[PDB]
């Protein structure tokens, strides 16, 4: 989530005064080249380096990745609601996330570098196979980076993280 290790250089700037979604690239600044769903969407030659996705009210979504002088970074699955990606389902006030890779092995989940869905002491947070259920989703509290990983592996080794921002 907060760390860029594992080629997860793409992060969301949560220092916005207006409801605009800005993306940042953690690469040696020379020129940042941005991509969305594989296609190039911009080329920043020095000066600015953040990518503006527009107002959050337009529900920006897509697999965003950047690239400096090295090779492209891992994707950042953006999912706003105001390679196989994570599946997001909203039903009333319940948000359900589906792990893209479910080989049948132990699926674990983490939210902002914090484990979730393991303890049964949480009625509003259940983990059922490759599905993470979030009941009574709190926009300000439950939004952020999410990632699923198999027991024994490092979360940073995931093919990409999921950035969820939802008003329910």
């Amino acid at each position, epitope marked *: 989530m907060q760390s860029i290790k594992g080629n997860h250089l793409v992060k969301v700037y949560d220092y916005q005064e207006d409801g605009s979604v800005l993306l940042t690239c953690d690469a040696e600044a020379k020129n940042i080249t941005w991509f969305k769903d594989g296609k190039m969407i911009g080329f920043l030659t020095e000066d600015k380096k953040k990518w503006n996705l527009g107002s959050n009210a337009k529900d920006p979504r897509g697999m965003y990745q950047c690239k400096g002088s090295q090779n492209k970074s891992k994707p950042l699955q953006v999912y706003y609601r105001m390679q196989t990606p994570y599946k997001v389902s909203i039903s009333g006030t319940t948000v359900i996330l589906t792990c893209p890779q479910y080989p049948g092995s132990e*699926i674990l989940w983490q939210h902002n570098d914090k484990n979730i869905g393991g303890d049964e002491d949480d009625k509003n947070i259940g983990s059922d196979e490759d599905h993470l259920s979030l009941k009574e989703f709190s926009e300000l509290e439950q939004s952020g980076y999410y990632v699923c990983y198999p027991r*024994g*592996s490092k979360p940073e080794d995931a093919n990409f993280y999921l950035y969820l921002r939802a008003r329910v």
Partner: single-chain antibody, 465 residues
Framework: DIQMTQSPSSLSASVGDRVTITCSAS?????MNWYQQTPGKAPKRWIY???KLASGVPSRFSGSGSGTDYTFTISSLQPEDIATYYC?????????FGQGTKLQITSGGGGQVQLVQSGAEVKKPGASVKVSCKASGYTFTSYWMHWVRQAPGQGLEWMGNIWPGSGGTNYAEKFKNRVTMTRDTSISTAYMELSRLRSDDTAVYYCARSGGPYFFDYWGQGTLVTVSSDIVMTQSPLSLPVTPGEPASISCRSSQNIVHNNGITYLEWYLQKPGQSPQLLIYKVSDRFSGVPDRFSGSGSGTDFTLKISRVEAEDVGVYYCFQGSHIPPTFGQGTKVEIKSGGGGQVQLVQSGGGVVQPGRSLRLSCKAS????????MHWVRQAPGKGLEWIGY????????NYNQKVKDRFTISRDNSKNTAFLQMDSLRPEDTGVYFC????????????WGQGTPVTVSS
């Protein structure tokens, strides 16, 4: 699955030679781990992060490599390094281990001064017992075979020498009229006949071999002769207990000044580790023998001697017997059985149970009790070692989440469960087959070190009709 290849599969090298083991992965691996497995023991993590030495690993071992090629090096091979070395990858499940490199000594006893004594003698009072000590690997006519006794309930007590080249024996006054020591230079074996066995003569009689700067350099196995119907050195600590890691210090006092007329103080400390013959630790008042860790460091002068083990480890537990030979009859101390105070902090232990012999098709449940740490903070893994095969990963379970993952070969027959209230993981094996026979070991996985650092002693499982 990423395939790990270890080369060579078996290596023989002489003491002191540099030994190199290579590990090749079928795919680029982020980190490689190296484990040392002694015959009959569980795997012990030696190197993590492909270059980092585990706690207690001597600096003579080193790991290196990146991508798909890794190398493990022993700069100076030691007799205690005889074990099977395994490399393990953790980048992807299942955690794959190499076939194992069986490391042995090329020469060994071929040239190593190895004295082999008679042993296992049972007598009756008033009789005579004669014990031999076949000295090999050295000019048996060039070193005296001094014979030392350690009665139960008392420290080491010398019992007289013999210079096998000439047969001219010295003897101890407490047996000068009773025990006779004779050499057989042709067969390279010194002998000791103790006559008129009493009640207090039941003991272990060791045959040393007095070296140049040390007495009792290489000691025989020791002969326990159980029969039933002097500058006094006392060791100030006795059964002094310490915590694994905590520095310890056993003091020892001399009845007179043990500074010899020649100016060299023949004070020494020998550490009879449990089940082993005493083996020298501080060759003079201060010098450490060759092959002893830098941890053991004696000190003292005048009449009082103190031994300071700088960091008590698991292997240092055992009686340190203080011997002074600047007096004519070599007299030892009472010796302080330095012991681990059990808990001594986080007793990270994995206790395995539930093994046995089961019929084909039946079910067996193994249990792994974790102590000394938060059971829910680390993943518990199961590894199987078949007779003659390397380590095979079975699966792991996350105690905090219940997350389990298994190897495809056993996913449909084995079930991994855990009990957080008892800090115990369970490995349920259903429809057992003869191919499932082996030692099952439980291991704690530390995500921060990406290595299985704590391993259970293993539970043997035999599938036989």
């Amino acid at each position: 699955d990423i395939q790990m290849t270890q080369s060579p599969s078996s290596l023989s090298a002489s003491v002191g030679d540099r030994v190199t083991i290579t590990c090749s992965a079928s795919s680029s691996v982020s980190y490689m781990n190296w484990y040392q497995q002694t015959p009959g023991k569980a795997p012990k993590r030696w190197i993590y992060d492909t270059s980092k030495l585990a706690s207690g690993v001597p600096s003579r071992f080193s790991g290196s490599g990146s991508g798909t090629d890794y190398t493990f090096t022993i700069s100076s091979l030691q007799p205690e390094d005889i074990a099977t070395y395994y490399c393990q990858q953790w980048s992807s499940n299942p955690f794959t281990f190499g076939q194992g490199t069986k490391l042995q000594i090329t020469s060994g006893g071929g040239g190593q001064v190895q004295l082999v004594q008679s042993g296992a003698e049972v007598k009756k009072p008033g009789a005579s017992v004669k014990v031999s000590c076949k000295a090999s690997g050295y000019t048996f006519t060039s070193y005296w075979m001094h014979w030392v006794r350690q009665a139960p309930g008392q420290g080491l007590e010398w019992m007289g020498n013999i210079w096998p080249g000439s047969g001219g024996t010295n003897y101890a006054e407490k047996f000068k009229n009773r025990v006779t020591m004779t050499r057989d230079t042709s067969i390279s074996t010194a002998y000791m006949e103790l006559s008129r066995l009493r009640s207090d003569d039941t003991a272990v009689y060791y045959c040393a071999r007095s070296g140049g700067p040390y007495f009792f350099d290489y000691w025989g196995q020791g002969t326990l002769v159980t029969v039933s119907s002097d500058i006094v050195m006392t060791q100030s600590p006795l059964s002094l207990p310490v915590t694994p890691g905590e520095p310890a210090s056993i003091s020892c006092r001399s009845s007179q000044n043990i500074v010899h007329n020649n100016g060299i103080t023949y004070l020494e400390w020998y550490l009879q580790k449990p089940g082993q013959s005493p083996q020298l630790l501080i060759y003079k008042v201060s010098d450490r023998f060759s092959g002893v860790p830098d941890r053991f460091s004696g000190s003292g002068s005048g009449t009082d001697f103190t031994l300071k083990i700088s960091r008590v480890e698991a292997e240092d537990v055992g009686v340190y017997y203080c011997f002074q030979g600047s007096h004519i009859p070599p007299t030892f101390g009472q010796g302080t059985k330095v012991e681990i105070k059990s808990g001594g902090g986080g007793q990270v232990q994995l206790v395995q149970s539930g093994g046995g012999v089961v019929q084909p098709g039946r079910s067996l449940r193994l249990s792994c009790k974790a102590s000394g740490y938060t059971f829910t903070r680390y993943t518990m893994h199961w590894v199987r070692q078949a007779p003659g095969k390397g380590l095979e990963w079975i699966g792991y379970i996350n105690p905090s989440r219940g997350y389990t993952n298994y190897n495809q070969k056993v996913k449909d027959r084995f079930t991994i469960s855990r009990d957080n209230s008892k800090n115990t993981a369970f490995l349920q094996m259903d429809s057992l087959r003869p191919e499932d026979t082996g030692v099952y070991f439980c291991a704690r996985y530390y995500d921060d070190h990406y290595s299985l650092d704590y391993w259970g002693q293993g539970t043997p499982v035999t599938v036989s009709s």
